[PDB]
Scaffold this active site. Structure first.
Site, short mmCIF file in Angstrom:
data_model
loop_
_atom_site.label_atom_id
_atom_site.label_comp_id
_atom_site.label_asym_id
_atom_site.label_seq_id
_atom_site.Cartn_x
_atom_site.Cartn_y
_atom_site.Cartn_z
N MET D 180 -41.77 8.23 -29.09
CA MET D 180 -43.14 7.73 -28.91
C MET D 180 -43.26 6.24 -29.23
SD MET D 180 -45.34 10.73 -30.78
CE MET D 180 -46.94 10.06 -30.34
N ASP D 204 -35.02 18.61 -31.64
CA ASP D 204 -35.70 19.75 -30.98
C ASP D 204 -35.55 19.60 -29.46
OD1 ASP D 204 -38.84 19.02 -29.88
OD2 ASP D 204 -38.34 17.69 -31.58
N1 LIG Z 1 -40.18 16.46 -29.24
C1 LIG Z 1 -40.77 15.25 -29.46
N2 LIG Z 1 -41.78 14.82 -28.65
C2 LIG Z 1 -42.34 13.61 -28.90
N3 LIG Z 1 -41.97 12.76 -29.91
C3 LIG Z 1 -40.97 13.17 -30.72
C4 LIG Z 1 -40.36 12.57 -31.84
C5 LIG Z 1 -40.63 11.27 -32.56
N4 LIG Z 1 -41.10 11.63 -33.91
C6 LIG Z 1 -42.49 11.30 -34.20
C7 LIG Z 1 -43.41 12.45 -33.86
O1 LIG Z 1 -42.78 13.73 -33.93
C8 LIG Z 1 -42.78 10.16 -33.28
O2 LIG Z 1 -42.66 8.96 -34.07
C9 LIG Z 1 -41.74 10.31 -32.14
O3 LIG Z 1 -41.09 9.04 -31.94
C10 LIG Z 1 -39.36 13.45 -32.32
N5 LIG Z 1 -39.36 14.57 -31.51
C11 LIG Z 1 -40.33 14.42 -30.53
#
Ligand SMILES: Nc1ncnc2c([C@@H]3N[C@H](CO)[C@@H](O)[C@H]3O)c[nH]c12
Ligand SMILES: Nc1ncnc2c([C@@H]3N[C@H](CO)[C@@H](O)[C@H]3O)c[nH]c12
Ligand SMILES: Nc1ncnc2c([C@@H]3N[C@H](CO)[C@@H](O)[C@H]3O)c[nH]c12
Ligand SMILES: Nc1ncnc2c([C@@H]3N[C@H](CO)[C@@H](O)[C@H]3O)c[nH]c12
Ligand SMILES: Nc1ncnc2c([C@@H]3N[C@H](CO)[C@@H](O)[C@H]3O)c[nH]c12
Ligand SMILES: Nc1ncnc2c([C@@H]3N[C@H](CO)[C@@H](O)[C@H]3O)c[nH]c12
Lengths: 224, 224, 230, 230, 235, 235
Positions: D180, D204
C-alpha cells in the site's frame, strides 16, 4: 521537410486520399492516377501526387491507428497546405443490417484519449465535414452504388479486451469500426480544412468493393 | 494467418526485433541477418526470420503509435508464439543531460487510455522485463557503448497540444519520448512473455548510433 | 401515461418540434399549427398537436439542460412512438463569423455533461444529428431563402461557465455555437433508432457583446423541414 | 525541523530503510544497527540512525498508505538530503506461484491512488524502483542465498477492496504482490533525483488462504544492499 | 435583469422557496402567501413575492436537473441578493423504510453530473446543505408535528438511469432518496456565502414502487410546504 | 482479531475517539479515562478502553491519510461492533477568520482520493458527518463554553500539495480547513449503519500561516478532547 515527409510545399494536391495500407496507396497510384509522381517514401509511406479527370489528386498511406494518422494529417494541412483529406479504407460491421457494403461516416466515436487531451477533457464530437459527406453520398448516388451513412467508432484496440462494447455500439446503431477517423476530423477542424471517410466492410465484428469505394471517393474528390 | 500477418506458426523466431520504420526493418535484413527470409509483407510491414551468430532472430516493423504496435505484438506472442520482443527505435530527449546517446527503458509512462482500458481505470505501470533490461545493459557494457537507463514516455500525440508537459517530464527525470513502449510491455506481461526497448536519440525535444544500438540489441538477443 | 406527460398514445404526431421555453412552445402552437390541441401540460410544459399544411405536427417544451431534455425525449421516442424531434432553440455564437440572429443548423454537438460517458462505457460518443434531418433543414432553408450555417454545436451543463478559457478553445476548433440540450437528444434518438436534429437562432455572442424575424425564420425552416421529412 | 520529524540536518544517513510498522522500525534498530540513536519520535514513528558493518544507516516507520509515505519520503529527500530509501515491508501475494514468506523485490508498482495522476497531468506515470537499487537487492539476495522474485507490485488505497474482481485481473497480468506504499515512494524519488526501491515478504495470499525467518531474510538483503549502494 | 429573470433587485425577498414544477410554485404562492405579486414569469417559471406570517417570502420554479437549478440559484444569489434558498420538491425513494408521501430532509447530496468536478478541479466536492437550514427544517417539522427523516440524497442527471445497479449501491450506503437538483444548488450557495437547504416528499419508490399521480404530486404535498415556511420564519 | 488489531469483540466500547497520532490517543487515555486498559497496540497504534463520567469510552490512533483510517474504521464497525466514531485531530486552516488553536466541526468533507469514486461507481459521494454527532459536538461545545465553527473540511491525499491553486479555490467555496482522514471515515460509517463525526483544532494555516509545534499539537489541544467526550456522553 517534416520528420515523416520528405516532399515539399506544393508537392501535394489540395486533395489527398489516404488509406491505412501503404501497398494499397500504391495500388491506386497505379490504378487511377495519371502521371503518378512518388513524393514521399519515408517509412515506406507511399506518397503520390497526380490527376484524375485533369484534377490534381494525391494518395498516401496513414498507418494503422489515431496516433499515426494524427501525424500525417496535421503535417498535410499545416505544412503541405492540403484542403481536403478523404480516408478511403476498410472497417468492421457492427450493424446487423450491414454486410461484407460501403459505409460513409458522418462522425466517429472513440476510446482514445486524444480528443480529450485537445479539448479540456470534455466530449469533442468528431464530425466529418458536411461538404465531404454530401460529396461522397451524391457520387455514390450517380454511380448507382448503395452506401450506408452514419456513425463510426475509432478503436485504439483492434483486439478489444472490453468485449461488452460491440453489443453496446450495436444498441446505439453504430455502423462500423476502424481506427483512424476520430483522430482526423478534429485536426481538419483545427486547421479550418475539411475531411471525410469511406468506407468498405472487410469483416463483421458480430458474426468490387475496393473498386466501387474508390470511384465514389474519386468522383467526390472532383466535386470538392 | 492473422489479418495483419500472412506468415505461419513457426515462421517467426522466438525473438523478434521490431522498429517503427518498415524500411529500417529491411535495412537490418539486410545488414545483420544471415539468410533473410521475407515472412510478412502485408501492409508492407517487412517481416523477416533469420539467424545471428547461429541463433534464430526475426525483424519487423510495428507502425508508429500504441494501437499499431499493440496489434503486431499481441499477434506475435499469441499466434506466432514469440517469447521476446525488443523494440529498437528512436526517441526524443527530455533529460537535459541526454543528447543526440542510447537510452534503455525500464518502463514507459503514457497519455494513451489503452492501459486504463485493460486495467479497470487504475494505473498500470508499463514495465520492461528485468531480464531484457539487464540483457541490454550488459551487452551495452561489453561493447563498451555508453547507454542511459531509465523511464520513457509513450505519447499518443507527436505534436502535443499540451505544451507544459515536456518540462513536467523533465522535472520527474523522464529520459525520452517515443510512441510505442507503453503499449508493448503490458501485452508481454499478459502472455507471460517478455519485452524491452532501446534506444537512440534522434532529436531533443527541449532544444553510428543506429549501428551501436543494433549491436547491443543483437548481442542482447543472444543472451536472452 | 408518464410521470412527466399526461398524453396517451396517438396524442403526439410523428414529428415533434421542441424548444426550451414552454411559452415559446405555446407561441408556436398558436401561430403555426392549425387546430392545436393541448395534449400535455404537466409541469406547465405546453405540448400541443395540430397540423401544418395538412401534415400532422407537435410542439412541446423541454426545459433547460441535458437532464430535462433527456426525460422528455426518451418518453416521446419510447412511450409515444415519435419518429423525429427537431429542437428549435436559441444559442450563444462562438465562431467569430456568426452574428446575432444568424441561423445555425447542427451537424452534431460537443458536451461537458457526463451523461453520454455514462451511456457509453466512459468512451467518447459523438452526438450527431441524423443526416436526413440536417439535409431537410438545409433544403428548407434554401427553398425559403434564409441563410443558415451548418456545423458543430456545444451543449454546456453550465450557462455561467467557470471554465473561462473554454469559449476560445471552441473557437479555435470552429464550433459555431453553444446551447444546453442537443448533446442529450442525439444519442437518445440513436438508441430508439429514431431521428433528431437541431436548429437555432443566435441570440447573443459569447466572444463579444452583441429578434422575432429570426425566430420566425427558424420556425419556417423547421416546419418546412418537418413537412419534407413526413 | 518538519511538522512530522523533529530531527535536524545530518541526523539521517544517506540511506534510510522504512517500513509501515513503527515498532518494526524499532525492532530493526535494536537488532541490526549498532549504536542506534532515536532521531525522530514525532507521532510515535520511531526513526533511528546507526551503523551496519561500519556503514551509516537509518530506519523509520512510514505508516500505512500512499498519503503517509508521501509525507515522510518527501521530507527525507527534501529537508534531510537522503539519497536512497528502501521500503522493507510485507505484502499479499497474487501471482499463483508466489507463496507465504517468499521474498519479492519490486521493479515497479501499479496503483489505484489518484496521487500520481495529480502529480502528472492526469496521465499514466509508471512508478518504477530505481535500477541500481533493484540490482543491489538482487545481488544481495544472491550473495546470501535467499531466493527473491522480481516483478511489478500493486499499491492499493483500499486494504479491504470492494473491487473484488481486481485480484484476478492483476493475476492475469502477473503482478507479484499487493502492498500500500510503493506507488507513492517511487515518483517522489524521481522528483528529487534520488533513488528508491522496495523489498517485501509475503505475509498472506490474496488468491487463497495461506515468519521471523522471512523477516530476518529480507532485513539482511535490504541491509547488505544498502552497504553496496553506499 | 438576467436572461431568465425579468424582475429587479428588491423584487425577490431574501428567502426563496423553489421547486422544479412551476405550477407547484404557483400553488404555494396561491395557497400561502398573503398578497402575492408575480415578480418573474419568463419561461413560465412562476416567481412570486408575498409574505407569510408577516415576513417576506418568495417562491419560484427552478426547472428539472442540475443545469437549470444552477442557472436560477446563481442569478438569485448574485443579482437578486437572495440570502436563503430552500428547495421543496420530490424524490426519489431508496430506503426500504421510506414510502410515498413520506418526508425527507437532505443533509447533502451525491451526484453524477461533471458539474461539481468542473467547478472544483475535478475532485470530490461535498454538496452539503447549510447546517442552519437543516436544523430549522428539522425544528419546524418537530413543532408542526410531522415526521421527517434526515439524511443524504443523490442528484441524478438521468431520471431514466441506464446504470441499473446504482440503486442497490445507494441502498448499501443508506441514501434516503433520489432527485435531480440538490447537488447543484448547495455548492452555489457556498460560492456566494449564502445558505441553502432541501426538503422533499417521496413521490415514487425506486426499489419497490409504488408511484404517485402528476396531480397529487403537483397539489397534494402541502406539509413540506408547511415545514419549509415555518423553517423560513426562523432563518 | 483483525491483522491490525489484536483485541476482541467486547474489548472496544461502542463509542471510540480517534486521532492520527497514536501518542495523542495515549494522552487522551491518560488524561481522561478512568481505568484505561490497553486493548490494542499492534503497530503501536495505542488503543484503550476505559470510562468517562461512568460511560464506556475508547480511544485509538488511526494513522494519517484515507487509506489508513479506512483500515481501522472498517475493522471497528465490522468486527468490533463499534456504534460511533468521533475523530478528534488537526487541520488545516483555509478560512481567513480562523486561526491556530481554533476549533472546527466538520459537516462533511471533500477529497481528492479515488477511494469514494471506487466505492461508488465513480460518481460524487457526499462524505457527510452524521447529523446526530454534529449536533452533539455542537451542543457540548456550547455547554462547556468553547467557540467552534461548523462547516466543510477537505481531506487531501497530499499534505505537500503540488496543486498550488487549490487552496484559494477551497477559499472561494468557503471550506473551513484541510485534513487528511474525514472523507474516508464518513462513507464507511454509512456503509455499516453506524455514526461518525469529526472535530479538529487548527494546527497551522494554509493561506497566511501561522504554525504550531509537534509538542503543542501533540499535548496542547485538550478542549476538542473535552467537547468530544461531552458529546460522546449524549450520543
Ligand atoms: N494482503 C495485503 N493487502 C494489502 N496490503 C498488504 C500489506 C501491507 N501491510 C500494511 C497493511 O496490512 C500496509 O502498510 C501494506 O503495505 C501486507 N499484506 C497486504
Ligand atoms: N474489425 C475491425 N476492427 C478494427 N479496425 C478494423 C479495420 C481497419 N483496418 C485496420 C486494422 O485491421 C485499421 O486501419 C482499421 O481502420 C478493418 N476491420 C477492423
Ligand atoms: N520527439 C519525438 N516525439 C515522439 N516520438 C518520437 C520518435 C519516435 N519516432 C516515431 C515518430 O517520429 C515514433 O515511432 C516514435 O517512437 C522519435 N522522436 C520523437
Ligand atoms: N449564450 C448561451 N450560452 C448557453 N446557452 C444558451 C442558450 C440556450 N437557452 C437556454 C438558456 O439561456 C438554454 O435552454 C440554452 O439551450 C441560448 N444562448 C445561450
Ligand atoms: N425516481 C426519481 N428519480 C429521479 N428524480 C426524481 C424526482 C424529482 N422530481 C423531478 C422529476 O422526476 C426531478 O426534478 C427530480 O428532482 C422525483 N422522483 C424521482
Ligand atoms: N496543512 C495541513 N494539510 C493537510 N493535513 C493537515 C493536518 C492533519 N494532520 C495530519 C498530518 O498533518 C494529517 O493526519 C491531517 O489529518 C493538519 N494540518 C494539515
Amino acid at each position: 521537410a517534416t520528420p515523416h515527409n520528405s516532399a515539399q510545399v506544393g508537392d501535394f494536391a489540395e486533395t489527398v486520399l489516404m488509406c491505412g495500407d501503404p501497398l494499397r496507396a500504391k495500388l491506386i497510384a497505379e490504378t487511377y492516377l495519371e502521371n503518378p509522381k512518388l513524393v514521399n517514401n519515408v517509412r515506406g509511406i507511399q506518397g503520390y501526387t497526380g490527376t484524375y479527370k485533369g484534377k490534381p489528386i494525391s494518395v498516401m498511406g496513414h498507418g494503422m491507428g489515431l496516433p499515426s494518422i494524427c501525424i500525417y494529417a496535421e503535417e498535410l494541412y499545416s505544412t503541405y497546405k492540403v484542403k481536403t483529406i478523404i480516408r478511403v479504407g476498410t472497417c468492421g460491421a457492427i450493424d446487423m443490417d450491414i454486410h461484407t457494403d460501403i459505409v460513409i461516416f458522418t462522425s466517429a466515436g472513440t476510446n482514445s484519449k486524444i480528443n480529450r487531451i485537445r479539448f479540456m477533457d470534455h466530449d469533442y464530437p468528431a464530425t466529418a465535414s458536411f461538404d465531404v459527406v454530401c460529396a461522397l453520398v451524391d457520387a455514390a448516388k450517380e454511380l448507382n452504388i448503395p452506401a450506408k451513412v452514419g456513425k463510426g467508432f475509432s478503436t485504439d484496440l483492434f483486439y478489444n479486451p472490453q468485449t461488452e462494447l460491440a453489443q453496446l455500439m450495436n444498441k446505439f446503431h453504430f455502423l462500423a469500426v476502424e481506427m483512424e477517423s476520430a483522430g482526423l476530423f478534429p485536426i481538419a477542424d483545427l486547421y479550418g480544412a475539411r475531411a471525410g471517410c469511406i468506407c468498405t466492410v472487410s469483416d463483421h465484428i458480430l458474426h468490387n468493393s475496393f473498386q466501387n469505394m474508390m470511384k465514389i471517393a474519386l468522383e467526390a474528390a472532383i466535386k470538392l
